[PDB]
Design an enzyme around this catalytic site. Structure first.
Site, PDB file in Angstrom:
ATOM      1  N   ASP A   1       0.842  -1.206   0.000  1.00  0.00           N
ATOM      2  CA  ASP A   1       0.000   0.000   0.000  1.00  0.00           C
ATOM      3  C   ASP A   1       0.875   1.253   0.000  1.00  0.00           C
ATOM      4  O   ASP A   1       1.327   1.693   1.063  1.00  0.00           O
ATOM      5  CB  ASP A   1      -0.957  -0.012   1.205  1.00  0.00           C
ATOM      6  CG  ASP A   1      -1.710   1.285   1.370  1.00  0.00           C
ATOM      7  OD1 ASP A   1      -1.927   1.959   0.349  1.00  0.00           O
ATOM      8  OD2 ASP A   1      -2.117   1.624   2.509  1.00  0.00           O
TER       9      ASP A   1
ATOM     10  N   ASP B   1      -1.471   5.507  -5.416  1.00  0.00           N
ATOM     11  CA  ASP B   1      -1.928   4.747  -4.251  1.00  0.00           C
ATOM     12  C   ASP B   1      -2.238   3.317  -4.700  1.00  0.00           C
ATOM     13  O   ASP B   1      -3.315   3.047  -5.256  1.00  0.00           O
ATOM     14  CB  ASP B   1      -3.161   5.431  -3.661  1.00  0.00           C
ATOM     15  CG  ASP B   1      -3.718   4.729  -2.439  1.00  0.00           C
ATOM     16  OD1 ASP B   1      -3.167   3.699  -2.025  1.00  0.00           O
ATOM     17  OD2 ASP B   1      -4.734   5.210  -1.896  1.00  0.00           O
TER      18      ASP B   1
HETATM   19  C1  LIG Z   1     -13.973   1.428  -5.037  1.00  0.00           C
HETATM   20  C2  LIG Z   1     -12.850   2.271  -4.492  1.00  0.00           C
HETATM   21  O1  LIG Z   1     -11.752   2.268  -5.002  1.00  0.00           O
HETATM   22  C3  LIG Z   1     -13.149   3.094  -3.258  1.00  0.00           C
HETATM   23  O2  LIG Z   1     -11.986   3.529  -2.351  1.00  0.00           O
HETATM   24  C4  LIG Z   1     -11.172   2.579  -1.740  1.00  0.00           C
HETATM   25  C5  LIG Z   1     -11.236   1.238  -2.088  1.00  0.00           C
HETATM   26  C6  LIG Z   1     -10.390   0.337  -1.456  1.00  0.00           C
HETATM   27  C7  LIG Z   1      -9.491   0.758  -0.483  1.00  0.00           C
HETATM   28  C8  LIG Z   1      -9.435   2.110  -0.140  1.00  0.00           C
HETATM   29  C9  LIG Z   1     -10.280   3.024  -0.769  1.00  0.00           C
HETATM   30  C10 LIG Z   1      -8.471   2.533   0.918  1.00  0.00           C
HETATM   31  O3  LIG Z   1      -8.783   3.342   1.785  1.00  0.00           O
HETATM   32  N1  LIG Z   1      -7.262   1.977   0.857  1.00  0.00           N
HETATM   33  C11 LIG Z   1      -6.223   2.218   1.834  1.00  0.00           C
HETATM   34  C12 LIG Z   1      -5.213   3.240   1.335  1.00  0.00           C
HETATM   35  O4  LIG Z   1      -4.123   3.302   2.250  1.00  0.00           O
HETATM   36  C13 LIG Z   1      -5.839   4.628   1.219  1.00  0.00           C
HETATM   37  N2  LIG Z   1      -4.822   5.610   0.826  1.00  0.00           N
HETATM   38  C14 LIG Z   1      -5.299   6.986   0.921  1.00  0.00           C
HETATM   39  C15 LIG Z   1      -5.691   7.381   2.328  1.00  0.00           C
HETATM   40  C16 LIG Z   1      -6.989   7.801   2.608  1.00  0.00           C
HETATM   41  C17 LIG Z   1      -7.342   8.175   3.892  1.00  0.00           C
HETATM   42  C18 LIG Z   1      -6.402   8.140   4.917  1.00  0.00           C
HETATM   43  C19 LIG Z   1      -5.104   7.718   4.668  1.00  0.00           C
HETATM   44  C20 LIG Z   1      -4.083   7.702   5.798  1.00  0.00           C
HETATM   45  C21 LIG Z   1      -4.113   6.422   6.619  1.00  0.00           C
HETATM   46  C22 LIG Z   1      -2.690   7.989   5.315  1.00  0.00           C
HETATM   47  C23 LIG Z   1      -4.759   7.354   3.369  1.00  0.00           C
HETATM   48  C24 LIG Z   1      -5.545   0.884   2.177  1.00  0.00           C
HETATM   49  C25 LIG Z   1      -6.559  -0.227   2.334  1.00  0.00           C
HETATM   50  C26 LIG Z   1      -7.474  -0.209   3.379  1.00  0.00           C
HETATM   51  C27 LIG Z   1      -8.427  -1.207   3.509  1.00  0.00           C
HETATM   52  C28 LIG Z   1      -8.489  -2.240   2.592  1.00  0.00           C
HETATM   53  C29 LIG Z   1      -7.580  -2.265   1.545  1.00  0.00           C
HETATM   54  C30 LIG Z   1      -6.624  -1.265   1.405  1.00  0.00           C
HETATM   55  O5  LIG Z   1      -7.700  -3.330   0.692  1.00  0.00           O
HETATM   56  C31 LIG Z   1      -6.973  -3.302  -0.546  1.00  0.00           C
HETATM   57  C32 LIG Z   1      -7.951  -3.613  -1.647  1.00  0.00           C
HETATM   58  C33 LIG Z   1      -8.683  -2.374  -2.142  1.00  0.00           C
HETATM   59  C34 LIG Z   1      -9.791  -1.972  -1.232  1.00  0.00           C
HETATM   60  O6  LIG Z   1     -10.530  -0.960  -1.883  1.00  0.00           O
END
Ligand SMILES: CC(=O)COc1cc2cc(c1)C(=O)N[C@H]([C@H](O)CNCc1cccc(C(C)C)c1)Cc1cccc(c1)OCCCCO2
Length: 377
Positions: A35, A220
């Site tokens: 990630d 990301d």
């Molecule tokens: C349909 C879509 O695509 C909708 O959106 C999505 C989909 C999505 C994950 C995220 C967002 C997600 O949040 N993923 C974050 C990343 O770290 C986020 N990075 C940016 C971020 C946002 C907010 C706060 C922070 C802090 C902690 C630095 C960082 C990591 C993550 C968290 C939970 C499950 C994950 C993966 O399973 C990986 C498979 C993909 C899962 O599908």
């Protein structure tokens, strides 16, 4: 010595790419999500319905408690746990062992994904966005500081279940074709970049380029979709609708809720446009573009009927926290996170997407004036 890391990643479509790691003495084996969108190293450390194994601190002679709690809220899901350190290795990575910060997850809410086959997360971004604050050294900073591994890594994410490569410490030239094109890392927190122009089927969206990076643009690997700020998402969905209006789809499809299916092998790829993202270059007034095929932003999904049709989810969605160049965008390409030189590189991947009259590409140079006005402040 990079051949040992080729094909070291696995995953399921839309459930993330993971690498195998070990923590503790004796080594406990876990699959860890890769990630670049966060900065905390965290693993399941307590039973969970979706976890088939987890970190058992009591069985590790090298485990040290840090007597501090921690919680991380993502865009999707959140977890809380206890901080500690332990020895960590990457079997199909560099041959080193580092003492790294580890958040032991004791509670979580819609974080672990049923059947994804990973048990933890490896946040590869910078300390500035680590929880609880930037004093918790991220894994990759520990790796570089305790070993001789050079301060860069590269991701080759291959599409649809799925595989790929994380080359830790360098660039493997057998994973891409053509030239690498580099965009500056704007600030070391997320992997923040500046998008300077957007074209759909060769037509400029003609928005003020600040909208593309309102309020940031990040690369990301932990997010599935291309996520766009409201005004940009609306413009792109309107342009993609018009290009595909030969067929019409439920409005729930354009919101990522409902699938669309076609008779196996008859998907009308030619009616969906290509998307070109122009990125800030390395020299004055110079940019480059990456071109995205619909085979990237129409993500294939399991059949919801008794048919053998080809079914897809629209993998572009709306954001209120800036542009997210997710895994679906990265899948076409070899992406080099050159931390040492504060830049991110793009090239066509060896596992590139195959349309029959069109091709994903990384092309330059282009001239773009006033690129620095595109960054949001
Ligand atoms: C349909 C879509 O695509 C909708 O959106 C999505 C989909 C999505 C994950 C995220 C967002 C997600 O949040 N993923 C974050 C990343 O770290 C986020 N990075 C940016 C971020 C946002 C907010 C706060 C922070 C802090 C902690 C630095 C960082 C990591 C993550 C968290 C939970 C499950 C994950 C993966 O399973 C990986 C498979 C993909 C899962 O599908």
């Amino acid at each position: 010595s990079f051949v040992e890391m080729v094909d070291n990643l696995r995953g399921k479509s839309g459930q993330g790419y993971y690498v195998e790691m070990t923590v503790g003495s004796p080594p406990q084996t876990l699959n860890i999500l890769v990630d670049t969108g966060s900065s905390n190293f965290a693993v399941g450390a307590a039973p969970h319905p979706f976890l088939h194994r987890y970190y058992q601190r009591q069985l590790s002679s090298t485990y040290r408690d840090l007597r501090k709690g921690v919680y991380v809220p993502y865009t999707q899901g959140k977890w809380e746990g206890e901080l500690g350190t332990d020895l960590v290795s990457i079997p199909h990575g560099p041959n080193v062992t580092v003492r790294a910060n580890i958040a032991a997850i004791t509670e979580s809410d819609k974080f672990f994904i049923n059947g994804s086959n990973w048990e933890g997360i490896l946040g590869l971004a910078y300390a500035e966005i680590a929880r609880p604050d930037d004093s918790l050294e991220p894994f990759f900073d520990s790796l570089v500081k305790q070993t001789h591994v050079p301060n860069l890594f590269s991701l080759q994410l291959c599409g649809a279940s799925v595989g790929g490569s994380m080359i830790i410490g360098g660039i493997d030239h057998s994973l891409y074709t053509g030239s690498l094109w580099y965009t500056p890392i704007r600030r070391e927190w997320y992997y923040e970049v500046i998008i300077v122009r957007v074209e759909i089927n060769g037509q400029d969206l003609k928005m003020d380029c600040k909208e593309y990076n309102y309020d940031k643009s990040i690369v990301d690997s932990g997010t599935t979709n291309l996520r766009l700020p409201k005004k940009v998402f609306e413009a792109a969905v309107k342009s993609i609708k018009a290009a595909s209006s030969t067929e019409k789809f439920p409005d729930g499809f354009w919101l990522g809720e409902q699938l669309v299916c076609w008779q196996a092998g008859t998907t009308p790829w030619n009616i969906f446009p290509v998307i070109s993202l122009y990125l800030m270059g390395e020299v004055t007034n110079q940019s480059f573009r990456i071109t995205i095929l619909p085979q990237q932003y129409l993500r294939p999904v399991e059949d919801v009927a008794t048919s053998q049709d080809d079914c897809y989810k629209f993998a572009i969605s709306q954001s209120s926290t800036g542009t997210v160049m997710g895994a679906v965008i990265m899948e076409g390409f070899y992406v080099v996170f050159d931390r040492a030189r504060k830049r991110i590189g793009f090239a066509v991947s060896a596992c590139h997407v195959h349309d029959e009259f069109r091709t994903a590409a990384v092309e330059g140079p282009f001239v773009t004036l006033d690129m620095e006005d595109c960054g949001y402040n």
